[PDB]
Amino acid sequence: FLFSSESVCSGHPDKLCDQISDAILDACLEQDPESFVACETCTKTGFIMVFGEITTKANVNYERVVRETVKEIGYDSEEKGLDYKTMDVIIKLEQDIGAGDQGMMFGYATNETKELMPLTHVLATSITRELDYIRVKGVSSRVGWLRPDGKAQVTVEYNCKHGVLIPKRIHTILVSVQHDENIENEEIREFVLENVIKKVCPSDLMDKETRILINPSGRFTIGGPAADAGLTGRKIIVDTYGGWGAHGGGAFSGKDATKVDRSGAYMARLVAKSIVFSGLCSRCLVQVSYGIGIARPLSLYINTFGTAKDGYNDAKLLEIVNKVFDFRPGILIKQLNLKSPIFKKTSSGGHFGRSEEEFLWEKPIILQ
Amino acid sequence: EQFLFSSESVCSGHPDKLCDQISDAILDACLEQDPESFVACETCTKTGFIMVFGEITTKANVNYERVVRETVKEIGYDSEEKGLDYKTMDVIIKLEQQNVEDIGAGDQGMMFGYATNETKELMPLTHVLATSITRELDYIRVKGVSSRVGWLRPDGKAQVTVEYNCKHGVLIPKRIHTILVSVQHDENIENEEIREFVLENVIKKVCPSDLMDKETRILINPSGRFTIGGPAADAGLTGRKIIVDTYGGWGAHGGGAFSGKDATKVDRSGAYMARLVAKSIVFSGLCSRCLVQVSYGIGIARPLSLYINTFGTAKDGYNDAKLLEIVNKVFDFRPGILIKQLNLKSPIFKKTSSGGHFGRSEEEFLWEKPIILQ
Amino acid sequence: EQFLFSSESVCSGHPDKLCDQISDAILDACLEQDPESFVACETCTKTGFIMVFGEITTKANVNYERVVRETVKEIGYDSEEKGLDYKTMDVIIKLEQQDKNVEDIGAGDQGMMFGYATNETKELMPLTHVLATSITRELDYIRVKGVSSRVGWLRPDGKAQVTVEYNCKHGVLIPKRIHTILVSVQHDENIENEEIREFVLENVIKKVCPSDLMDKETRILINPSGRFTIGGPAADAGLTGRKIIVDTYGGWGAHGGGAFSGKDATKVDRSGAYMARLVAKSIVFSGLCSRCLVQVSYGIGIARPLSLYINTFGTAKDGYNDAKLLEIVNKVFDFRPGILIKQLNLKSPIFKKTSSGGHFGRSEEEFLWEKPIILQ
Amino acid sequence: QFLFSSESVCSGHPDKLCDQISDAILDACLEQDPESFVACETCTKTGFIMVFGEITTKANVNYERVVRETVKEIGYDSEEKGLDYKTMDVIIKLEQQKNVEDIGAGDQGMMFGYATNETKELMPLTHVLATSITRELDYIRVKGWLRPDGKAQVTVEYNCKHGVLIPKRIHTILVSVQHDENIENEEIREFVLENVIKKVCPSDLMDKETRILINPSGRFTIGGPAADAGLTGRKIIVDTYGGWGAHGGGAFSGKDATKVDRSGAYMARLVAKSIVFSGLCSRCLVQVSYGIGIARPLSLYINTFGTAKDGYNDAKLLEIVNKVFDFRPGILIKQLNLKSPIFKKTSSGGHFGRSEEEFLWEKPIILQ
Ligand SMILES: [Cl-]
Ligand SMILES: [Cl-]
Ligand SMILES: [K+]
Ligand SMILES: [Mg+2]
Ligand SMILES: [Mg+2]
Ligand SMILES: [Mg+2]
Ligand SMILES: [Mg+2]
Ligand SMILES: [Mg+2]
Ligand SMILES: [Mg+2]
Ligand SMILES: [Mg+2]
């Protein structure tokens, strides 16, 4: 079968909101590691609004954080879809441990890739992260024509043998990249193919029939918030596993670590990755469920899709996980260092499959 | 094989679901006057305000602010103590006014449909129960006798854990393991009265007694009283309950919220069609549960690929190729066609925006009316 | 042994049922302000008018006309073509206006109240009745709550009748098949009969009737005598208390006489029937029999019934007999009128919801007579 | 062993007054036009009577005059008595609008007939006694101090053996009788006991413990609509079997014979009575159901409560019924002579168990 995943650039209006929500979270954490933050952002023509609840001892200039985050992402002109200098900023923020809410969270891993992530998502997010890296770090004489909005989608043809996923070929790569009026389509295409697609997509999975589409619906000068509304938590599948596995519905950005929607998902990722990395299966889905005010999870579930190593079964894996891993929120927070202001980096490019040293949920443990 | 699994639901007054309902109320308001409207309507809320924003192409003449205020009034937010008062809140409307069948998909979309014979609704039991609890609370609160249940307030949530046995891919619920209900209420009712009310009038009404036992763990406001709720307690946004809206953690999700989007958004209409297909397969007895996976490609009307996973439950003879042949003979997944076949250019969407989009048999939900397949 | 049996229901817009709903809307309006109200409220209707008459003793200050007009609006009578328009109709009010912990008031006459229950359905009601009333309730729900551009051709009047073929084994009733389903639905002039019939079959019958009891020979009759555009009060006069069998058990059980709607709970014809239902439902729910008729005989000036009689039709659980069941019932239940009213919370404005769809077999929060007790 | 009570009311009871007016109007139409369709409802309260519904007729009827004459004949000629035919308001809201074996039913509906060998009338004893008391009060008054309102209730102690009902004793007789103000209670009680109760009730079922109550709630001088609102069709259990058997819900009075609510119930009575009179069972309940526009019944049901004669069962009885009796409306209307103006006589005192020659549904057929 064919399977597709999407990623979006840091300048996509929804991801802009996630990044602002987490920039505010980090700003609070830098001064008060005990901050509680539930920060939502939305955006459209000429404005950003930040709303929700914060309990902090930190003294943070919320508007200044918003405007600086938008500046760093590159929205410095109305022509691009938003200007940090001219936009309106609306601030409506209200100023044995149990979970802070109910909810379920899933973690997933697969040995398809070195990241232990599904290949479609690895590739789409590699494309968008590379575009953002080039835009922000390349010389303006070469790359100044790039604007912040964009997305990529990758369709892979799979074979599925006894639960094991074997990519056969890359079927389609779709890239949308916002740009200024002065660059012609041919140059856009050549730049993206040579400096992005061929840099991150393995040539051994491409062939002459691979469909490569770059701004296929026409030029893309009009973008950002002026072109499309954005909101925090509207890219939760981009943020996690790209359509694979399952999702409990909870968004990550703008939430401090006492929100199990984030910390429980991070821990479930650590567990599934550890099971797969230890060679006990090829693919693993973990579901953890909490109840408000209750420290131990109401439930835990493991599915290896029939790929468990001979000698192991999903029930034995759960027994092991219960011996090794602790899902009580206070322990998750301490073990994963979730009071550190590390979260802005998670809010674009996917929360999982990431190689930064500060993402402890991606450092697997050996299980036996 | 034996395992635990949980699903959640939220009440109509939960702040996120409040936004979904406003967004779909505005969509319906446009479609009743102009069935060809394009709508991409977002709503967000926090203490004392609702903001509607996004884009609309319509010939309709709609009083958007009155639609907002009337929707919030109907949900029951009529006093600050409840968390929002439709009479006093600020309302911002930032909606920007901008027979063919072969229109292509807009991107490399993934649509999923799921069904299972665990319930008469052909939905997973964990999700059926959690959403039944929240729907029943909403029904009692809104339609009940005020001198009896006027102490209910609009916010609330539920979560249900079921212990399953799995025999050859077939899911047989063994018992209800945990039921968690959080219900907002006024200051005058005591916890014992809340808990007895919820147990007798909601849980025992909607949860099958043969799956409950003395060990079933029942948690009702376990973290203390819940008087402060709604937008005063918690910000809401459209499209932040997409798993409640679909299958409660079962099946799969490709991304993309439903509410506030007209049917030309295939993230919505394609998901509805995929549900109809899975439901029809299970309803016809061709398997006990299945996942239907539809892969679209940009500029192409027919799906690039169709994949059906029966989890090993297919009726003998109905191998994957046979099921695919049947589905492709009966069903048309082209966006232009699925919109007409499901009658989606019709103001039917407000009812979808609380209680789940699937497993409910309303006259206007054609994706829940299964086709007999052989 | 096999036999056929039929029950009927009518829609909330049926003229007789419209009157029942208005009478209980007035009762609830009074009780909401004065739980001690005495109400004996009759309603009748014909072209362009509703008349409310009878007797009320209340401290409530009620705009009776507005209660009537809002009830008619909610039912959907908003145009003369449908048979009544709440905006134009005359509402004629001819109501003759006139220690609260006493429990030992006697019955007012030699009353007979009956309760019935049967394990044929989850509702513990006879299947013929469950299906007929499910059909009409679903029609009402679609008409009132559905999308107007889709179902706005529906008009408020209508009826249904359902015949079930039963097997009877040792007094136990086992539905064998649905024999005949009859539905009459009022509609506007623009919808064709084939669309009407397909709509009713797919969205009503197949939704509420269990498919395993339907077969190729099941007779389905939908507006069989022709079109049904002319209906409601303009076509057919209506009066309170003319649907007392739809209101109860559909021909099963028994009825001692006396309508329910418009009467507050001190009228034991109503409260006593509710209590008898709770007892019969509790016996069946507890598994002590498969079907149960509970008969209560009151005497004038006496609070406790003169006689209590239970018939289990030979279906009593092994170990129980009718005499043992009566001993149980007499230990658990109190049939004194003042006690019935307190135990069932009947001085509460709970009655409007009873007045369409049957008073029994529905599980609303405010219906305590449908919340069974475990008996052993 | 149990107690069972039935009620009857006098012709001046406000509900029964409405039944009588409705049927007086039906008879008035039929006497001029035997093909009349009539659906005449009546309601009443202090000082007023309203007749409302639908009529299709060739007759020329002064409806107001029928109303006043019926009320005069019942005896309401003064406001002291509760109603004065001379001065009351009469409101008229009556709106004026082939092959016989093939005439369909005019409506859907379900109707029961019942018979029991407890009495020569083949009716339940409780009902026989209660209606005999009220009919006798009316006869004495109409054919010097009685007034038109009144009611009677009789409680009988029964044994039920194998479906057969055996009266053991009369437990309670309750009689309310309206009267002139100048009559002393002792005279009222002696008259009712000696000239009615002891004449109607069999002495071998009376004993010293029989509870006999005559106006136990006090004097009763004002009655009729002044005492209580009345409506047509609100005494349907009085009209039929007094709580025995079953009821389909349909009222009789004010309806011509094309209303199967009436004609079907009359035919069902004839069937049950014939089965019991023929000695084929001791007790019999018949249910017939019709659908609108359909001549043949949708369903027929016979229950003999286990009392069928040796050799018979409910199925054979149904076969016999289907051979002998025709429930098609056009046919039963002819067989029972239901186009003749006979209906005012039915409208108080019970429709069944009556000996007047014009009630053909009480003339049983011998069946084998
Ligand atoms: Cl939430
Ligand atoms: Cl009554
Ligand atoms: K979301
Ligand atoms: Mg978005
Ligand atoms: Mg998409
Ligand atoms: Mg929120
Ligand atoms: Mg009575
Ligand atoms: Mg009528
Ligand atoms: Mg005299
Ligand atoms: Mg009355």
TrEMBL record, chain A:
Q: Which InterPro entries match?
A: ADOMET_SYNTHASE_CS, S-AdoMet_synt_C, S-AdoMet_synt_central, S-AdoMet_synt_N, S-AdoMet_synthetase, S-AdoMet_synthetase_sfam
What family is this protein classified in?
Belongs to the AdoMet synthase family.
Query: What biological process terms from GO does the record include?
Result: one-carbon metabolic process; S-adenosylmethionine biosynthetic process
Binding locations of Mg(2+) 1: 14
Q: Please list the residues that bind Mg(2+) 2.
A: 40, 228-229
Q: Which cofactor does it need?
A: Mg(2+); K(+)
**Where along this sequence does the record place binding of Mg(2+) 4?**
144
NCBIfam families, A to Z: metK
- State the species of origin: Cryptosporidium parvum (strain Iowa II)
Q: Where does Mg(2+) 3 bind?
A: 101, 261
**Residues of the S-adenosylmethionine synthetase central domain:** 96-220
The Enzyme Commission number assigned here is: 2.5.1.6
Q: What is this protein called?
A: S-adenosylmethionine synthase
The record's keywords, sorted A to Z, are:
ATP-binding, Magnesium, Metal-binding, Nucleotide-binding, One-carbon metabolism, Potassium, Transferase
The pathway is: Amino-acid biosynthesis; S-adenosyl-L-methionine biosynthesis; S-adenosyl-L-methionine from L-methionine: step 1/1
Automatic annotation (TrEMBL), chain C:
Report keywords, A-Z: ATP-binding, Magnesium, Metal-binding, Nucleotide-binding, One-carbon metabolism, Potassium, Transferase
Q: Which SUPFAM superfamilies match?
A: S-adenosylmethionine synthetase
Entry EC no(s): 2.5.1.6
Recite the UniProt cofactor note for this protein. Answer: Binds 2 magnesium ions per subunit. The magnesium ions interact primarily with the substrate.
| Positions bound to Mg(2+) 3 | 109, 269
| Binding site residues for Mg(2+) 1 | 16
* Annotated GO biological process: one-carbon metabolic process; S-adenosylmethionine biosynthetic process
Q: Name one GO molecular function term.
A: metal ion binding
Q: Locate the S-adenosylmethionine synthetase N-terminal domain: which residues?
A: 3-98
Task: Give a Pfam family name.
Answer: S-AdoMet_synt_M
Chain positions recorded as Mg(2+) 2 binding sites: 42, 236-237
Q: List the catalysed reactions.
A: L-methionine + ATP + H2O = S-adenosyl-L-methionine + phosphate + diphosphate
Every S-adenosylmethionine synthetase central domain range: 104-228
Signal sequence bounds: none
| Family annotation (Gene3D superfamilies) | 3.30.300.10
Q: Which NCBIfam families does the UniProt entry name for this protein? A: metK
Q: Which family does it belong to?
A: Belongs to the AdoMet synthase family.
Q: What does this protein do?
A: Catalyzes the formation of S-adenosylmethionine from methionine and ATP.
Protein's recorded name: S-adenosylmethionine synthase
Q: What is the lineage of its organism?
A: Eukaryota, Sar, Alveolata, Apicomplexa, Conoidasida
